[PDB]
Amino acid sequence: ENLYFQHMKHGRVFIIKSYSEDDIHRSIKYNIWCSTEHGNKRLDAAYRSMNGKGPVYLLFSVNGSGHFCGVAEMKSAVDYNTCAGVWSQDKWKGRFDVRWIFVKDVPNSQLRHIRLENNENKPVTNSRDTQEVPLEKAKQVLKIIASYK
């Protein structure tokens, strides 16, 4: 058995949906990310209210790709006034640090049975950017991602 993920109560988990394979590569290389304005606000609130008592996990997926591509932990609050144009589009403003802890393609077919009661019970694989995942579903997603071969 693996009871690792079932045994934790302080952590928050968000879906990250990116249009750009370049931005994913840049994020892995430099351990930084930037969301939209309302996305950044959502993640910043979650990070600051955690007060380092548990992780904020980010489950990354490229829009239309059919799979998740990895997992990162958020590692700073959002700095909203930073260099413009570092991402594939110049519409994203700011920067926060992440730490990629898992880089692996996980097909949507391995996760589409997990549904989000906070998103009309839609499959977790039909989420939009910065969709939050209830902890009990997040544990199941993390276990499937960690065990996929």
Ligand SMILES: Cc1[nH]c(=O)n(C)c(=O)c1N
């Ligand atoms: C870096 C970045 N941040 C985002 O919020 N979205 C929605 C993207 O597509 C992307 N490439």
